[PDB]
Design a binder for this molecule. Structure first.
Ligand SMILES: *[C@@H](C)[C@H]1/C(=C/c2[nH]c(/C=C3N=C(/C=C4\NC(=O)C(C=C)=C4C)C(C)=C\3CCC(=O)O)c(CCC(=O)O)c2C)NC(=O)[C@@H]1C
Ligand SMILES: *[C@H](C)[C@H]1/C(=C/c2[nH]c(/C=C3N=C(/C=C4\NC(=O)C(C=C)=C4C)C(C)=C\3CCC(=O)O)c(CCC(=O)O)c2C)NC(=O)[C@@H]1C
Lengths: 857, 859
């Protein structure tokens, strides 16, 4: 049924011919009407040449003679009768060649695309905008991809549908033109899409259905041999009745499904998901557009695959940071030092609280329960856990604890380790919320018919909190080893999904470490270094590290050349002089002849009284890609050291006279006067505070990304409107343009809660260019209305209006952005942060700005 | 021939030991007095009896070591007197030689006792050398010479450098004030005997303490069957001829350091020397002359990375020439070669160009007369028929009868013949070649050194720069292009070998080229691409370029993976719309396992009617280092653009509220104003005006260089002083600092003719940091004196210890970071210097004074 089925959609015709005789043997029922109806009859034994013109016949013959027909697929042919062009898509199967003919609509791309490259040309804008995006954001990539698919196809309600590890699908993004229901975040069972279709989407990467209720046309074979004739590869295949019923229940009758195949992991291609478009009315799309979409999907898959590895780099970067911090704590003494100094045990692993139980004393910091609660915790640990030195229970409620209920919500995520019989360490986490809105019946790992489970659902969780990862437990184990060694097996459990007795042994995380005397003799050579190099601590000790241990000839470890020797000496001397570790590239040859290339971090050793008593160094074995990225960043950043200095200088030289006007205004406000210039003083102080808070902002990218912090406080609309109008009265009077305020007294005197400074900035800039783009003698009317408080702001200014290129700039659809356009985008992003939008309206002689803001009243 | 020398310098002692039994077999006459005096030193004496047991214990360890050079300088005390000495040990064939040098009481304790402690003394010089941006050799040489000057402390330091003919040329020099410069002089190759050049590759540091000093004898053992070599010892005496040469140069002490670079065949090569000269006897401890052997090694490393950066400029020039040749490949006949924006003058570096086409002349710059062009063509035809191109550095030496008529305008010419009569000329102007050549002339025993180093000059005849090897290749490529285009070996002569005409053979520079029509089929596949890939043209043409020729399977050239296929399609489609030649990374496999990695450049094939007919692509075979450098530059440009936009953001959002403050101030002026409120109003106006001017400035480097145009106006000192004070008294109240003024009323009432904004900014900054450094409850007094042109002197005296000297050094402009405070200090000092003044810092017990001097106009 999904595989074969002598039924095809009726918007095209099909013809299956033999490999050698080039004679028709399978023909669709509607082929005669579509092709030869103004003559040979389309019956078994008819040729393909008779019913087509000489150039069309020659082109078809050449295409059939071609080896890889997948390149020149859209072969625009002409009927033997008057015109009637047809696209002539071609597929090959074992023993047969199937040609699908589709009518060519003259009003849309006639002869524009007749090959793979011309078809691919139709997605250039989408491809270049996908490429132009910055890296590091998967959700941004998905949103852009679905938005471009929606714009290019002309459908509605396009959606990205991602497959999880259990094959249950989840909607990730969506874009719809009207105000229909948003399908976003809903989860669907893994049985919605059968394994047959999922495997069939490995090939036939684009599937199209035009009408649900269209009467399918039968395809009749020949009664002679070669009964095998499969229609899986054809673009005219009748969808299965079950999916037909499902789509009918889903108030859609058209569909265009494109598979996303990520070619990563060790072929081994995996179906990441689908880009599904659903239409409530019949829709047809020319083949070049559907071939341009099978190319955009490949580009999207490439970008997703390349984002996965950028995500992967962060884990190893965090591991390197943890190793550095572990060495830092190794350089200290006593259990008091891990918590006393700045980088504490709260920084070893992400958490919300830390506790140390040392000799019947508690050192706690962060979100921790009461001391007696920890005492009962330790009593239960020493009463029921003797076989393990630790554990990681994500939910203390799930594990056995009589008093877990009364502990609270900010607890029950634990990681505990016993340094000794009594003295132990605890890491505590709070609760993390999480819920799902399953779109139907949960799969809970056919002739089933439709079920109409496209309604709603809700599932919640509890204080189970975030899971504890593996390298985190490795870090805690390494800290335990360090503390135990400093004082003078290691099996502990894990309780994740209430399954008891999950015993696992982790591995230490200590990096290779070596250390030299002040003269140069080698003193410290830890087992990790012995494993990495192959040497033994006994045979490398009381020797010169520069020249004997590391040397170009007759040395245990061989440096490549003399430049490495010079650089090693330079970094040793600099580290004895300079402060804090310096990372340098370091490469050598092992005893067995294997090249090793890592990073070296060196730092001075210290005694109890001042003097430097040697050098302590360790190696970071970063991966090759991280090393290249760090090297490129280091090389490139050497040319950019002046920009921050200039920025700081400008900030200082603006802050000084800003304080000067602060001080003069302090005098002016100090002396008592009448009301009007006191009001002017208040407005000037408000504008000057706006200037000051604009100054302290550091980076623009925070505003662009829409993550800027908001200061919430009281204000009134009258003062903000007056300040904004005052900021541009001078420019309004420069062009003699009158500005009027039609806001009512009730709205004007309203008291609201929000960020008045940003609102004043936005309104002042809008009024500013409204004055700019209003011809002299014109009028600009600003009105405000209040309706959770919704502030509606109308700016109606006379004149022709702002040119449309600036409009496409402010909407963010144009990459070429001017400084004015910079002001526009910043303003629009801030308005979006304020739960609103900025709109532009053009009428005869009047251009009007719509501003919508959300404020608390 | 120095192995026979048996004479040593008298500043130390030399002691030889037999390799087997560690007994004395050679002692200098100086050793008996230097060490023993407070047993008789003879043959076979036990070395242990010479020094104390704690001191002698380190010795046997040192001789027992494998590579003793890692622990050479050993502090040793004698057995009885316990006088400190530095011992340096080295090994000769069948013997161990030790040199003992007295330890000067400059620093008798601590110091260095190994090869790594001594290296520490050059850390500052190494850091300064490493912090220098790359690109120029002159900066490196001057920095190296300056650091040597600072470290050693000799009178003169020079960076003598060898040329190909082994003749030297001083490249840099930094001397004590006075004396006599030597920069630019050239010296004969006979000043450095080959023996010294060979010896320096083994002993990289050589010291002479006194040319005229009483020497000592080695007193070799009679029982030795071999002569004791003294070449490697640091106490070896030099040659008498070289002593006389030092006497002629008016120098006594000397400390030379060889520079050895690694030239790929790796082979050592003596790049040059670093020579230190002193007019008086001088002594330097061993650790310093071991930190100089390390600094020289670092300098040699850095002087071989400014040679690879010069092998990349040539490759970049080759790539640019190839791009320009491809540009001329698609053009309409001749007369578009000359008229269009890139012309023949951009092909090779020349001063003039000319084209002779069908008895007509086209010119593009400094060229001789048209009749002179016809005469040149006639002479070249009547004298050279078996050559299609010629290159002469000098036309007079070439044999041109009328070369003297041209004069200084043209000296060198490169010409090619596209047709029988039609030709192309590049003319390069005459340049002057002058060499100072001090001393004597260089032209390829008991000889005594010359007594005079007179600087007699040398000058060459009428000559220009020589035509390089690849310039002829570019000209030949243009010749081939025009020859092929006209239809629809060659034996170029290059007379510069000084042996009349020598005939060479050039090779073209044309890069691999291919091209497709609008449907994707291959249409152009040039021989260079065939050589690069191995595919003959007839095996490729009329095939789908993307999918059949370049594909991931069953294709002529195999791409690596699917991403390359997608990227190639994307580039081929984007080239039709963008039209720009876009360099993209390309990589493919040839017929046999060759992973070619190059740069693809694609451009459309727009025709006369304005309709495209395919694409035209060519590769650019570039080395990995050049590709990485281009990638790094491209990465940095985006960051620069982003930072520029980010900086441009803030100015508008500061200016708009500023405009608000201005409008409110005008409305305040419109309303009622009191007497003192009026004064506060003008102070606020002045301060906000200063803010407006400082914000509206866009280029700080304009002020830094000195191109800032000050706003000439009229003002008074009292108003500027009040405006500058009002900016800082908030911090004065923050630290409870009391500000006082002692200026006379006449100066306040005096009218000043100048810029008040800059003076106000400078004064505000000065009192700001003066209050910052003033302790709580302190005093800050301002005194202004005006003398009538009116000279103004301002004294700012504040309580406290004082501003640290590093801030003053940053003010004077002697630091890199400088810091916000230091940079503001430097800017204020430069602005005062524009007023022909300076900022002075005076320190007294509990007092610190800023002194500012300036001049203005008065009426
Ligand atoms: C006499 C036979 C000729 C001669 C002999 C000679 N020269 C050397 C060694 C050196 N000559 C040096 C020359 C220079 N140093 C300078 O200051 C300048 C110019 C400003 C020059 C040209 C230098 C340096 C050396 C290296 C040794 C050193 O101690 O500096 C020797 C070898 C001596 C030894 O150590 O055995 C000899 C035999 N040089 C001459 O120019 C005269 C004509
Ligand atoms: C029948 C009782 C079961 C069933 C069968 C079935 N489904 C398909 C194909 C598809 N199912 C799709 C599902 C979704 N699309 C959406 O919009 C969402 C969620 C938002 C879901 C879950 C899609 C898409 C397809 C592919 C359509 C296509 O044209 O390729 C098939 C294969 C039909 C075919 O013609 O190959 C079959 C047999 N699906 C069910 O939900 C029930 C349980």
């Amino acid at each position: 049924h999904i595989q074969k089925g002598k039924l095809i959609q009726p918007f095209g015709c099909l013809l299956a011919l033999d490999e050698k005789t080039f004679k028709v043997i399978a023909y669709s029922e509607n082929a005669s009407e579509l092709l030869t109806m103004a003559h040979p009859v389309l019956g078994i034994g008819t040729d393909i040449r008779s019913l087509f013109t000489a150039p069309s016949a020659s082109a078809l013959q050449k295409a059939l003679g071609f080896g890889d027909v997948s390149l020149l697929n859209p072969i625009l042919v002409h009927c033997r009768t008057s015109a009637k062009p047809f696209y002539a898509i071609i597929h090959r199967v074992t023993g047969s060649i199937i040609i699908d003919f589709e009518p060519v609509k003259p009003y849309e791309v006639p002869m524009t695309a007749a090959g793979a490259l011309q078809s691919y040309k139709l997605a250039a804008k989408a491809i270049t905008r996908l490429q132009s995006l910055p890296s590091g954001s998967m959700e941004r990539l998905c949103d852009t991809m679905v938005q471009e698919v929606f714009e290019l196809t002309g459908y509605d309600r396009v959606m990205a549908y991602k497959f999880h590890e259990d094959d249950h699908g989840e909607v990730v993004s969506e874009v719809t033109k009207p105000g229909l229901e948003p399908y976003l975040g809903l989860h669907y069972p893994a049985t919605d899409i059968p394994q047959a279709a999922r495997f069939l989407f490995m090939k036939n990467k684009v599937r199209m259905i035009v009408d649900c209720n269209a009467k399918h046309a039968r395809v009749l074979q020949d009664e002679k041999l070669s009964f095998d004739l499969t229609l899986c590869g054809s673009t005219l295949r009748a969808p299965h009745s079950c999916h037909l019923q499902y789509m009918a229940n889903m108030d859609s009758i058209a569909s265009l499904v494109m598979a996303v195949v990520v070619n990563e992991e060790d072929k081994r291609k995996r179906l990441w998901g689908l880009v599904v478009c659903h239409n409530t009315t019949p829709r047809f799309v020319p083949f070049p557009l559907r071939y341009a979409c099978e190319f955009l999907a490949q580009v999207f898959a490439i970008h997703v695959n390349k984002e996965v590895e950028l995500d992967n780099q962060m884990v190893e970067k965090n591991i390197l940071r943890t190793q550095t911090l572990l060495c830092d704590m190794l350089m200290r003494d006593a259990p008091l030092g891990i918590v006393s100094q700045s980088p504490n045990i709260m920084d070893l692993v992400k958490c919300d609280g830390a506790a140390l139980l040392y000799k019947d004393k508690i050192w706690k910091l962060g979100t921790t329960p009461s001391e007696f609660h920890l005492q009962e915790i330790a009593s239960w640990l020493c009463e029921y856990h003797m076989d393990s030195t630790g554990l990681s229970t994500d939910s203390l409620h799930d594990a056995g604890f009589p008093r877990a209920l009364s502990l609270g919500d900010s607890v029950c995520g634990m990681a505990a380790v016993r340094i000794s019989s009594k003295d132990m360490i605890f890491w505590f986490r709070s609760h993390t919320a999480g819920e799902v809105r399953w779109g139907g019946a949960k799969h809970d790992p056919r002739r089933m018919h439709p079920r109409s489970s496209f309604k709603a659902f809700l599932e919640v969780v509890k204080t189970r909190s975030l899971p504890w990862k593996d390298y985190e437990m490795d870090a805690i184990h390494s800290l335990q080893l360090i503390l135990r060694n400093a004082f003078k097996m290691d099996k502990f459990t894990r309780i994740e999904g209430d399954y008891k007795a999950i015993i696992q042994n982790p591995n230490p995380l200590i990096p290779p470490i070596f250390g030299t005397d002040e003269f140069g003799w080698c003193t410290e050579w830890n087992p990790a270094m012995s494993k990495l190099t192959g040497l033994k601590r006994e045979e490398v000790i009381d020797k010169m590290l520069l020249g004997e241990v590391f040397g170009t000839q007759k040395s245990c470890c061989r440096l490549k050349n003399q430049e490495a020797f010079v650089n090693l000496g330079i970094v040793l001397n600099n580290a004895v002089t300079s402060q804090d570790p310096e990372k340098v590239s370091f490469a050598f040859f092992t005893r067995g002849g294997k090249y090793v290339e890592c990073l070296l971090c060196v730092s001075k050793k210290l005694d109890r009284e001042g003097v430097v008593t040697g050098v302590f160094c360790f190696l970071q074995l970063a991966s090759h890609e991280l090393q290249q990225a760090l090297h490129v960043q280091r090389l490139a950043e050497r040319t950019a050291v002046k920009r921050l200095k200039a920025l700081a200088y400008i900030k200082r030289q603006i802050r000084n006279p800003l304080s000067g006007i602060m001080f003069t205004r302090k005098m002016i406000e100090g002396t008592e006067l009448g009301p009007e210039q006191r009001r002017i003083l208040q407005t000037s102080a408000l504008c000057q505070k706006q200037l000051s808070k604009i100054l302290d902002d550091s980076d623009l990218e925070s505003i662009i990304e829409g993550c800027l912090d908001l200061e919430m406080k009281e204000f009134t609309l009258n003062e903000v409107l007056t300040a904004s109008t005052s900021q541009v009265m001078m420019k309004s009077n420069g062009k003699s343009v009158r500005i009027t305020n039609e806001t009512g007294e009730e709205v004007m005197s309203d008291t609201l809660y929000g960020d008045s400074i940003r609102l004043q900035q936005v309104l002042a800039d809008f009024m500013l260019m409204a004055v700019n783009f209003t011809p002299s003698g014109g009028q600009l009317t600003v009105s405000a209305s209040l309706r959770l408080a919704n502030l509606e702001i109308r700016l109606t200014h006379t004149g022709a209006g702002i040119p449309e290129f600036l409009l496409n700039q402010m909407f963010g659809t144009e990459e070429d952005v001017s400084e004015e356009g910079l002001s526009l985008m910043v303003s629009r992003k801030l308005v979006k942060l304020m739960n609103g939008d900025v709109q532009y309206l053009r009428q005869a002689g009047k251009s009007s700005f719509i501003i919508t803001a959300e404020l608390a009243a």
